[PDB]
C-alpha cells in the first residue's frame, strides 16, 4: 500500500491493486520401448529396464 503525508488529501484517494502469478504445466515424460515375442523367453533383461526407467 502507498502512503502520503499531510492534512489535506482532497481527492488524492488511492485505488487498490493486487497482482498475479500463473503456475504452469509441462509435456509428459516417457520411457518407451518394444520387444519382439522371441525376446521374452527370458524376462531377466525386461525386468531390469523397467527398474532402469524408474
Amino acid at each position: 500500500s502507498p502512503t502520503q503525508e499531510g492534512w489535506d488529501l482532497t481527492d488524492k484517494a488511492t485505488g487498490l491493486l493486487e497482482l498475479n502469478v500463473a503456475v504452469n504445466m509441462g509435456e509428459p515424460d516417457n520411457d518407451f520401448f518394444q520387444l519382439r515375442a522371441d525376446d521374452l523367453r527370458d524376462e531377466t533383461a525386461y525386468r531390469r529396464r523397467i527398474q532402469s526407467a524408474a
Binding site: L35, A37, D38, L40, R41, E43, Y46
Partner: protein
C-alpha cells in the same frame, strides 16, 4: 585322433575330382533313423507385455 579316421588316404596335389550328377533324375533318399533332427521351441506370447491380445 586316428580313431576317427574314415579314409585311408589324404588328398594328393593334382587329383581328379568326379562329379556324380550327369542327369536331372529325381532322387530316392535313404537314411538310418535319427539322422535328421527337428528342433523346436515355443513363442512366448503369453507374457504381460502382449496383454492387448488373446
Amino acid at each position: 585322433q586316428r580313431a576317427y579316421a574314415n579314409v585311408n588316404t589324404s588328398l594328393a596335389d593334382a587329383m581328379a575330382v568326379n562329379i556324380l550328377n550327369v542327369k536331372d533324375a529325381r532322387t530316392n533318399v535313404f537314411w538310418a533313423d535319427d539322422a535328421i533332427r527337428i528342433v523346436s521351441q515355443p513363442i512366448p506370447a503369453n507374457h504381460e507385455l502382449f496383454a492387448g491380445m488373446k
